[PDB]
């Protein structure tokens, strides 16, 4: 196989999100394109990245495969690569993976090598669930919320009011209330059925922290005691999608 993605910083962002608390990442190459999936220890936050084949500059595959790779070190070296308009490449190897970043300004062709576990392709399990609330907002908005929800409390309750979204944390003394509506600051809102759900603030923080690097609009979506879907289309094409499991009782 051979993978060329237009913007290394965007691709690095992808790696950063799915390898948040972990350093093991299972990259899967399918007929559809690249995808990688990572659940948390407590199985509440699921990080998924889809990169469709048409978005990529080059995409070759001998056969749909998965690679388990320790990216702990690759993380560090990929960042100090000043990826302005730099292009990342991933190739198949005897040893495992091969990652080459081609810098435009500096001329630096930095190539990485990591031990990969060439296993069978994983299944892209997109939770079958009708989320009545689908709002699309800036990622900065999400980060502002994440950062000041985690300041006041441990849990974040997103609810709906009359054409408004009510994010509220804080349980007794230290309460926090936010109101997100269309055009302040929501780029688009869609309330089908009046819905309300509670999420782990730490896990929302972590999801939204992964949204840094993608300036493109972010769709958030949820429903009455249903998961939250936070997905961003990558600047240079691709998908960064987070699922946060809800809290019932």
């Amino acid at each position: 196989f051979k993978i060329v993605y237009p913007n290394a910083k965007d691709f690095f962002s992808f790696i950063n999100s799915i390898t948040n608390v972990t350093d093991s990442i299972i990259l899967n190459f399918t007929e559809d394109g690249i995808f990688s999936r990572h659940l948390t220890e407590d199985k509440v936050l699921m990080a998924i990245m889809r990169i469709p084949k048409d978005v990529l500059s080059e995409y070759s595959i001998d056969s749909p495969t998965s690679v388990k790779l320790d990216v702990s070190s690759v993380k560090k070296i990929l960042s100090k690569a000043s990826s302005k308009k730099a292009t990342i490449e991933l190739t198949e190897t005897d040893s495992g993976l091969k990652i080459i970043i081609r810098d435009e300004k500096s001329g630096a062709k930095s190539t990485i090598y990591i031990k990969a576990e060439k296993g069978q392709v994983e299944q892209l399990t997109e939770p079958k669930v009708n989320l009545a609330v689908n709002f699309t907002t800036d990622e900065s908005v999400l980060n502002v919320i994440a950062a000041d929800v985690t300041l006041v409390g441990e849990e974040m309750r997103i609810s709906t009011e009359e054409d408004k979204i009510k994010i509220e944390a804080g349980e007794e003394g230290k309460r926090y209330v936010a109101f997100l509506m269309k055009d302040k600051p929501l780029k688009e809102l869609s309330i089908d059925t009046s819905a309300s759900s509670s999420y782990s603030a730490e896990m929302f923080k972590d999801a939204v922290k992964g949204l840094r690097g993608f300036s493109a609009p972010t769709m958030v979506s949820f429903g009455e005691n249903l998961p939250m879907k936070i997905d961003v289309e990558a600047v240079s094409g691709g998908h960064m999608i987070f699922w946060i499991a809800p809290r019932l009782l």
Partner: protein
């Protein structure tokens, strides 16, 4: 009470400068504005901030005199949540100080009041034999630049010039501030010399982003008054005691 700051960021900095000295204080909310006063644990710094009615766009009092107790860590923790553009609509009952950010969107932070020791504000004036009016930024600049050179800010005046010195073991750091320098807008006073704990004066720089102009009051073996001219007749006073 119900008070609205249009420059949430500047206000954010007033209360962060207080948090450098005081752990806990009281918003003393009266008809004529919100007064915050207190003395630091080392009993070297007396700070006195006054934010008048006119400093807040839409200032309403719920009673004749409201005393709002608050931990300065907790209040600055939520004030660290300011965004460049939003406004702070800080209102309160007798249970919770509710601070509301409003710009990109609406964000309210509920913060329960606490019984705070009532420090008696400086209803006493001191006479300083030297005064220097100096732009808040130009002070903020040297003090920041000097605060890494020694613990003892040795400030003295000679013929309406103001000298900041950092007299250390190895060497000395001398800064000539004059009216003819273009660094002091005005300065007149006796030729006095006194030293002050740098740490304390250092902390006072944050006011840079809250005030524009400034006044500097000092004298031989009396406190260094730092008057940070806030908008709408505002002031951030910081009396810092001298060294024996």
């Amino acid at each position: 009470m119900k008070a609205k700051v249009i420059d949430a960021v500047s206000f954010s900095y007033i209360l962060r400068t207080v948090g450098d000295f005081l752990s806990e204080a009281n918003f003393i909310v009266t008809k004529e504005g919100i007064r915050v006063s207190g003395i630091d644990p080392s009993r070297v710094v007396f700070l006195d901030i006054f934010l008048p009615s006119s400093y807040f766009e839409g200032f309403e009092v719920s009673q004749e005199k409201e005393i709002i107790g608050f931990k300065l860590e907790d209040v600055n923790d939520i004030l660290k949540r300011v965004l460049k553009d939003d406004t702070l609509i800080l209102s309160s009952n007798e249970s919770k100080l509710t601070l509301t950010f409003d710009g990109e969107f609406t964000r309210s932070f509920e913060l329960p009041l606490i019984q705070v020791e009532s420090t008696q504000p400086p209803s006493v004036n001191l006479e300083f034999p030297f005064k220097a009016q100096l732009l808040t930024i130009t002070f903020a600049d040297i003090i920041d630049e000097l605060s890494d050179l020694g613990e003892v800010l040795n400030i003295h005046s000679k013929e309406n010039k103001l000298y900041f010195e950092v007299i250390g073991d190895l060497s000395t750091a001398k800064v000539e501030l004059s009216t003819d320098n273009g660094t002091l807008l005005e300065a007149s006073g006796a030729d006095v010399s006194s030293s002050y704990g740098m740490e304390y004066v250092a902390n006072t720089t944050k006011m840079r982003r809250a005030s524009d102009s400034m006044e500097l009051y000092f004298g031989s073996q009396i406190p260094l008054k730092l008057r940070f001219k806030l908008p709408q007749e505002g002031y951030g006073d910081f009396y810092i005691a001298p060294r024996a």
